Write an enzyme that holds these catalytic residues in place. Structure first.
Site, PDB file in Angstrom:
ATOM      1  N   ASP A 179      -4.395   8.817   1.351  1.00  0.00           N
ATOM      2  CA  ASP A 179      -2.922   8.803   1.158  1.00  0.00           C
ATOM      3  C   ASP A 179      -2.498   8.190  -0.172  1.00  0.00           C
ATOM      4  OD1 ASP A 179      -3.528   9.139   3.867  1.00  0.00           O
ATOM      5  OD2 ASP A 179      -2.039   7.660   4.544  1.00  0.00           O
TER       6      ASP A 179
ATOM      7  N   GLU B 283       2.691   9.946  10.778  1.00  0.00           N
ATOM      8  CA  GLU B 283       2.249   9.071   9.692  1.00  0.00           C
ATOM      9  C   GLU B 283       3.137   9.219   8.469  1.00  0.00           C
ATOM     10  OE1 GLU B 283      -2.049   9.994   9.200  1.00  0.00           O
ATOM     11  OE2 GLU B 283      -2.362   8.297  10.576  1.00  0.00           O
TER      12      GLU B 283
END
Ligand SMILES: *[C@@H]1O[C@H](CO)[C@@H](O[C@@H]2O[C@H](CO)[C@@H](O[C@@H]3O[C@H](CO[C@H]4O[C@H](CO)[C@@H](O)[C@H](O[C@H]5O[C@H](CO)[C@@H](O)[C@H](O)[C@@H]5O)[C@@H]4O)[C@@H](O)[C@H](O)[C@@H]3O)[C@H](O)[C@H]2NC(C)=O)[C@H](O)[C@H]1NC(C)=O
Ligand SMILES: *[C@@H]1O[C@H](CO)[C@@H](O[C@@H]2O[C@H](CO)[C@@H](O)[C@H](O)[C@H]2NC(C)=O)[C@H](O)[C@H]1NC(C)=O
Ligand SMILES: *[C@@H]1O[C@H](CO)[C@@H](O)[C@H](O)[C@H]1NC(C)=O
Ligand SMILES: *[C@@H]1O[C@H](CO)[C@@H](O)[C@H](O)[C@H]1NC(C)=O
Ligand SMILES: *[C@@H]1O[C@H](CO)[C@@H](O)[C@H](O)[C@H]1NC(C)=O
Length: 517
Positions: free
Chosen positions: A22, A222
Site C-alpha cells: 500500500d 481497507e
C-alpha cells in the site's frame, strides 16, 4: 541504481529491491511529494512490514530514501510492524512535537503487534492486535520518531466492536478547515465499516461517526479516504470516500479493488448521496474496472483542483507470484481526482498525473487517420515497451469491436488487446495471451468497464503501456482499467484490429515515453 530489468516500470514507482504494497503517508509539502509505502526491508514477499520512503518534485522522477519506519525488532523477532496510514504537516504545532521553531510532520498509522506485550506507554496489547499510533519528523520526512510515550493513541475499535481488535486499520488523517479539527478515517475491516474520529492535537481522539457497510462487501474493507472534489467547472463540490476491499473487486476480476462513494461531510458525518448507494452488497462505484488498482490513497497538502490519489498496481490474488526480480510490485500512474456530471450523476474522473512533457515528446512516433478503417488488421509498427497511445473513433462504426494489439510478438500470437465493444459500449482489456500468464489461474482474463461515447458520438481512449503494465483512461477519465502484463523481450509490436466490419473516423497516435530513473 540500475533500474533496467525486464518488467521494471520506467515511469511507475517501485522500490529498488524487495516487496512493496500500500502507498502510505502521501503528503505534498514545501515543493516535495512524499511517497511512503508498505515495505519488507528483508525480502521479496510480504513481511517485516515497514514504511519505505521515496520523494519527487513532480510525481514522476522518484528518489528512494532510507526506510522511514523500520519494523521494531527487524533482524530478530519483530514486535511491531508499521501497517498503512497517512501523514500531515502540523504547521501550527497542535501536537507539540515542534522543536526550535521547526514544525513537525506527523504520520498516523496502524501498529500491528505480533506478540502480547507491555508498551513504553504502559498500555498492554494482545497478540495480533491492530491499533492506531503516531510518529513525527523534524527533518522534512527524512527520519521519524515514534510517539513511544503514548502510543497507541487509538488502542481499540469502538464499542461494541471490541472483538475486532485484530482488524482495525489504515488511518487516513487530514485537517478539516471548516470545523478546525483533525479528522481521521479508520476501517473496522471485517465488518465493512469505517469509524471517524476528531482531534485538536493529533493525540487525543474522539469517535464522531461510523460509515457503512454499503455496496461492495465481498472482502475486507481497507484504505479508507475522504476528500472534497470539484464538480464540473463551476463552484459546486462533493465529498468522496474511496475504500478498497479484498477480495470482491470489480466485476470480471478475482481479488482486490477500489470502490467509492459520493456525498457530503460536515466535519463529523459523511452522508452518502441517495444515488451513490445501491440495494444489496454487490453493485458499487468502481474507481478502476481492472484487476490491478488497490489501496488507493489521497495526498494531503493539495488544493481543491489539484487532488491526486496513488494506487498499488497489483492484486492480492496473485501479487506474491508476479515474476519480478529483485523488487516486487509498483504503484500505478498517479491519478488526478475530480468529479464530472455524466449521465445525470456525479462521476469520478481521473487524469494521468505525471510530468509527461519531461519524458514524452508531442511528435508522435506513429500517427494515422482513417475515414473508414478496413475490417481486419493494420500492418505492424514497433513501439518499444514504454509509450502512450491515444485513440478516437466513431461510436457509429459497423465493426463489432475496434482494438489495438499492444506489446505483441512479431506474429501477434502474444499480445494484449485494448478495445471497445460497440454494441455493449464497453472498454475491454484482454491479457489472456499477454506473455507470462502461468503463475495464477485467474490472470489470463479479459476485463471490461462501461464507456459511453461523448455528445458527438466519439469514443476516446488514452492508453499507457510500461514494462509490465497497461492503464486505459476512457473518455474524460470516467472509466479507467489498470492491468499488469508480463510480455517477452520481443513483444514490442502493435497493430489496429477492426473485427466484424469497418471502424469509422479513426485517429491513432503513439508517443514514446522515456525512463524516469
Ligand atoms: C524479514 O527480514 C529478515 C531479515 O532481517 C529475513 O530473514 C533473512 O532471510 C534471508 C533469506 O532471504 C536469509 O539470507 C540467507 O542467509 C544465509 C546465511 O545466514 C546466516 O548468516 C547471516 C549473516 O550473519 C545471519 O543473519 C543468519 O542468522 C539468521 O539465521 C540463523 C539461523 O541459522 C539464526 O540463528 C539467526 O537468529 C538469524 O535469524 C545466519 O546465521 C545464507 O547462507 C543464504 O545465502 C541467504 O542469504 C537471512 O539469513 C535472514 N536473516 C535473518 C536475520 O534471519 C526474513 O526472511 C524476512 N521475513 C519475511 C517474511 O520476508
Ligand atoms: C493553523 O492556524 C491558522 C490560523 O489560526 C488557520 O488558518 C485559518 O483558517 C480559517 C478557516 O479556514 C480561516 O478563516 C482563517 O482566516 C485562517 N487564519 C489565518 C490568520 O490565516 C489554520 O486552519 C490552522 N491549521 C492548519 C493545519 O493550517
Ligand atoms: C451478500 O448477499 C448475499 C445474498 O445475495 C449473501 O449470501 C452474502 O452473505 C452477502 N455478503 C455479505 C458479505 O454480507
Ligand atoms: C507491412 O510493411 C512492410 C514494410 O513496409 C512490408 O514489407 C509489408 O508488405 C507490409 N504488409 C504486410 C504484408 O505485412
Ligand atoms: C509466433 O512466434 C513465436 C516466436 O517468437 C513462436 O514461438 C510461435 O510459435 C509463433 N506462432 C505461430 C502460430 O506462428
Amino acid at each position: 541504481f540500475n533500474y533496467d530489468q525486464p518488467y521494471r516500470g520506467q515511469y511507475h514507482f517501485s522500490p529498488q529491491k524487495n516487496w512493496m504494497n500500500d502507498p502510505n503517508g502521501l503528503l505534498y509539502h514545501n515543493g516535495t511529494y512524499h511517497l511512503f509505502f508498505q515495505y519488507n526491508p528483508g525480502g521479496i514477499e510480504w513481511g517485516n512490514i515497514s514504511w519505505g520512503h521515496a520523494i519527487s518534485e513532480d510525481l514522476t522522477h522518484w528518489e528512494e530514501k532510507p526506510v522511514a519506519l523500520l519494523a521494531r525488532g527487524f533482524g530478530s523477532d519483530v514486535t511491531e510492524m508499521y501497517f498503512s496510514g497517512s501523514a500531515v504537516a502540523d504547521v501550527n504545532n497542535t501536537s507539540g512535537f515542534g522543536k526550535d521553531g521547526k514544525t513537525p510532520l506527523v504520520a498516523m498509522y496502524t501498529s500491528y503487534y505480533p506478540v502480547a506485550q507491555t508498551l513504553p506507554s504502559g498500555q498492554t496489547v494482545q497478540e495480533d492486535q491492530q491499533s492506531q499510533s503516531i510518529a513525527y519528523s523534524l527533518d522534512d520526512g527524512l527520519t521519524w520518531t515514534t510517539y513511544d510515550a503514548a502510543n497507541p493513541v487509538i488502542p481499540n475499535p469502538p464499542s461494541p466492536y471490541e472483538a475486532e481488535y485484530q482488524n482495525f486499520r489504515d488511518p487516513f488523517v487530514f485537517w478539516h478547515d471548516e470545523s478546525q479539527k483533525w479528522v481521521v478515517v479508520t476501517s473496522i475491516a471485517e465488518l465493512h465499516k469505517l469509524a471517524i474520529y476528531t482531534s485538536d492535537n493529533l493525540k487525543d481522539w474522539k469517535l464522531v461517526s461510523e460509515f457503512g457497510p454499503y455496496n461492495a462487501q465481498g472482502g475486507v474493507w481497507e484504505c479508507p479516504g475522504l476528500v472534497k472534489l470539484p464538480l464540473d467547472s463551476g463552484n459546486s463540490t462533493k465529498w468522496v470516500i474511496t475504500s478498497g476491499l479484498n477480495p470482491g473487486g470489480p466485476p470480471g476480476t478475482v481479488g482486490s479493488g477500489t470502490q467509492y462513494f459520493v456525498g457530503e461531510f460536515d466535519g463529523t458525518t459523511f452522508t452518502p448521496d441517495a444515488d451513490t448507494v445501491y440495494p444489496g452488497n454487490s453493485t458499487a462505484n468502481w474507481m478502476d474496472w481492472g484487476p490491478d488498482f488497490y489501496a488507493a490513497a489521497g495526498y494531503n497538502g493539495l488544493s481543491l483542483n489539484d487532488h491526486v490519489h496513488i494506487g498499488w498496481m497489483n492484486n492480492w490474488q496473485y501479487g506474491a507470484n508476479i515474476p519480478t526480480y529483485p523488487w516486487r510490485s509498483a504503484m500505478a500512474i498517479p491519478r488526478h481526482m475530480a468529479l464530472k456530471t455524466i449521465g445525470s450523476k456525479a462521476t469520478l474522473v481521473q487524469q494521468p498525473q505525471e510530468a509527461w512533457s519531461s519524458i514524452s515528446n508531442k511528435r508522435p512516433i506513429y500517427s494515422r487517420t482513417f475515414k473508414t478503417l478496413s475490417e481486419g488488421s493494420t500492418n505492424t509498427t514497433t513501439t518499444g515497451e514504454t509509450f502512450k497511445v491515444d485513440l478516437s473513433f466513431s461510436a457509429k462504426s459497423k465493426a463489432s469491436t475496434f482494438a489495438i494489439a499492444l506489446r505483441a510478438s512479431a506474429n501477434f500470437t502474444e499480445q494484449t488487446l485494448v478495445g471497445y465493444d460497440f454494441a455493449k459500449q464497453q472498454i475491454f482489456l484482454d491479457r489472456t495471451h499477454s506473455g507470462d500468464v502461468s503463475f495464477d489461474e485467474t490472470f489470463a482474463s479479459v476485463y471490461h468497464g462501461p464507456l459511453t461515447p461523448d455528445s458527438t458520438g466519439v469514443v476516446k481512449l488514452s492508453i499507457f503501456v510500461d514494462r509490465s503494465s497497461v492503464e486505459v483512461f476512457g473518455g474524460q477519465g470516467e472509466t479507467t482499467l489498470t492491468a499488469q502484463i508480463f510480455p517477452s523481450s520481443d513483444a514490442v509490436h502493435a497493430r489496429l484490429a477492426s473485427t466484424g466490419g469497418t471502424t469509422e473516423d479513426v485517429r491513432a497516435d503513439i508517443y514514446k515515453i522515456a525512463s524516469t530513473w
